[PDB]
Paper text:
Sister chromatid cohesion is mediated by cohesin, whose Smc1, Smc3, and kleisin ([name]) subunits form a ring structure that entraps sister DNAs. We present crystal structures of [name] from the yeast L. thermotolerans in the presence and absence of the conserved [name] region that interacts with [name].
The region within kleisin [name] of cohesin that binds [name] has been mapped previously (Chan et al., 2013), and we therefore synthesized a 23-amino-acid-long peptide from L. thermotolerans [name] (121–143) containing this region. In the [name]:[name] complex structure, the [name] hook opens because the [name] peptide is wedged between the spine and the end of the hook, maintaining a closed-ring architecture (bottom). In the complex, [name] is in a mostly extended conformation, except toward its C terminus, which forms a more compact arrangement with helical turns.
Author numbering: 125 to 141
Write the structure that this text describes.
């Protein structure tokens, strides 16, 4: 968990950022 990066975007905002 500490070595892995989680997410930080939803599913409606993926490549729209």
């Amino acid at each position: 968990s500490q070595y892995l990066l989680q997410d930080a975007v939803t599913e409606r905002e993926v490549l729209l950022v």
